[PDB]
From a paper:
DHODH is a rate-limiting enzyme catalyzing the fourth step in pyrimidine de novo synthesis. It catalyzes the dehydrogenation of dihydroorotate (DHO) to orotic acid (ORO) to finally generate Uridine (U) and Cytosine (C) to supply nucleotide resources in a cell. Thus, by targeting DHODH, the single key enzyme in viral genome replication and immune-regulation, a dual-action of DHODH can be realized in fighting against a broad spectrum of viruses and the corresponding pathogenic-inflammation in severe infections.
Additionally, the two inhibitors exhibited a clear trait of fast-associating (kon) and slow-dissociating (koff) inhibition, providing themselves as ideal drug candidates with a high level of target occupancy. Moreover, S312 and 416 displayed almost no kinase inhibitory activities at the concentration of 1 μmol/L when profiled against a panel of >180 kinases, suggesting that S312 and S416 particular inhibited DHODH rather than other enzymes. The results in all further confirmed that compounds S312 and S416 inhibit viral genome replication via targeting DHODH and interrupting the fourth step in de novo pyrimidine synthesis. Notably, S416 is reported to be the most potent inhibitor so far with an EC50 of 17 nmol/L and an SI value of 10,505.88 in infected cells.
Author numbering: 32 to 396
The structure:
Amino acid sequence: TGDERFYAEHLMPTLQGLLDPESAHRLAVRFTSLGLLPRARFQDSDMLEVRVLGHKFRNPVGIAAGFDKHGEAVDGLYKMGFGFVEIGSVTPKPQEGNPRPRVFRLPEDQAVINRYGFNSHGLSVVEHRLRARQQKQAKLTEDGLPLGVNLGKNKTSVDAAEDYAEGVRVLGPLADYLVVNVSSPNTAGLRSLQGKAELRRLLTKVLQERDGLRRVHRPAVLVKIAPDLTSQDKEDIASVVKELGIDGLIVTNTTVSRPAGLQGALRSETGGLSGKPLRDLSTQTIREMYALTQGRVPIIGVGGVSSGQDALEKIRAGASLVQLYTALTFWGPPVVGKVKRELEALLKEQGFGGVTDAIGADHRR
Ligand SMILES: Cc1cc2nc3c(=O)[nH]c(=O)nc-3n(C[C@H](O)[C@H](O)[C@H](O)COP(=O)(O)O)c2cc1C
Ligand SMILES: CN(/N=C/c1ccccc1C(=O)O)c1nc(-c2ccccc2Cl)cs1
Ligand SMILES: O=C(O)c1cc(=O)[nH]c(=O)[nH]1
């Protein structure tokens, strides 16, 4: 509570005054990679444990893709108190991404806009980085701290499906789950991989490559979607996910929309918008996808989570797990313990025995 206020009121506003957002992001990854973090003194209650995607999750609060793009800070993120870590997006070949500046703060909106453009060390570098800690990760996973890997595609690739297939082959064996991110707003054409006969063809190839891995090295496969889909796109995705036995959905990526009421000077920058203005658009997308999949497809809920109330709203809408990113940039590492403490308190107040009991509760009212 002391360092929650110190981080929110003094340290983060001081860092944002001294460093542009991408510099601050880079420094945050370096500090995290060295374990230079405040005490994550919140101890996970049994109430927070979730069993989904073939794994135990000690707590349902994960770090979303895009913070640790290149798998440099995984151990530091568990030390921060995340129940699970997602690295990436990782592209087959190394690529630089967009020219700088490409990350923009909207302080008045508690939002960020980014157009990183899948800056990636590439699969080989990330493969060797995860191999160096593979057994340490096996023990973390067994102790309820799973690892996800988010797979992207290179800007100049002539075959999107083959880029994802390469990622399944190279990083699948090192991951508890993989994510096919057909929802970055910052690679031309990527989101059109969300339409039907082509999405079926893409996901069929990804699942075949996954099913070709040895049993102990066989990850869950999730599809990560945009909040910007049409009703037709969402019904098509739900249909294909059920038909192919996709293991879960991540709902949602950043929005290319600009909700009415943004105040930030940088609101008209090109890129994906994250944080508070995405929150309820994300929650509503979770609700719709949970209904279209009859509650049979696990959802990881993400977009504008900054409190236990935000986490519980996504859980009651249909999420089994949640992720956050943008809240960490505003409030720093103490926001993780804050979300967990508030979520545990709210579950008790609303008469839930644990997270599991709350999943999709709004659909049963
Ligand atoms: C700076 C930045 C970089 C991101 N890069 C990625 C990415 O590489 N892959 C991805 O799937 N999502 C990426 N995202 C999206 C987040 O994973 C998340 O879906 C989105 O930001 C909503 O969560 P939030 O409001 O808690 O930040 C990125 C988000 C931000 C803010
Ligand atoms: C600056 N910052 N992230 C910044 C950041 C990251 C991504 C995008 C934008 C920004 C931004 O500045 O607008 C963090 N710092 C930590 C952190 C990590 C370890 C120890 C102490 C801290 Cl405060 C986590 S995220
Ligand atoms: O630009 C990126 O790398 C990136 C940004 C974002 O918001 N989402 C994503 O999937 N990729």
